[PDB]
Amino acid sequence: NEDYARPEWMIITVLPVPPPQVRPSIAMDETTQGQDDLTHKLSDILKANINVQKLEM
Amino acid sequence: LMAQVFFGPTYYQRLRHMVDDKIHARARGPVQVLTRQPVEGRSRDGGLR
RNA sequence: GGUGUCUUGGG
DNA sequence: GGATTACACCCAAGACACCAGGCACGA
DNA sequence: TCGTGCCTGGTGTAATCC
CA distance B34 to B20: 30
Burial (0-12, 13-18, 19+ Cβ within 10 Å), A35: middle
Phi, psi angles (nearest 5°) of residue A23: -135, 50
Phi, psi angles (nearest 5°) of residue A55: -70, -45
> Which amino acid does the sequence have at A19?
P
Q: Is the CB of B22 under 7 A from strand D?
A: yes
CA B18, B45, A32 angle in degrees (round to 5)? 120
- A40 CA vs E17 C1’ separation (Å): 36
Enter the DSSP assignment of A33: E
Taking Cα atoms as reference points, which of A44, A18, A20, A46 lies closest to residue A33? Answer: A20
Query: Reported resolution in A?
Result: 5.6
- A9 CA vs E15 C1’ separation (Å): 36
CA distance B30 to A41: 29
- Experimental technique used to determine this entry: cryo-EM
Q: Which B residues between 23 and 42 have a beta carbon under 7 A from any strand D atom?
A: 24, 40-42
- A50 CA vs E3 C1’ separation (Å): 36
CA distance A22 to A51: 27
CA distance A26 to B40: 16
- A25 CA vs D22 C1’ separation (Å): 28
- Sign of the Cα torsion A42, A43, A46, A51 reads negative
CA distance A28 to B40: 19
Contact yes or no for A39/A45 (Cβ under 8 A): no
Residue A24: partners with Cβ closer than 8 Å, 6 or more residues away: A36, B33, B34
Contact yes or no for B48/B29 (Cβ under 8 A): no
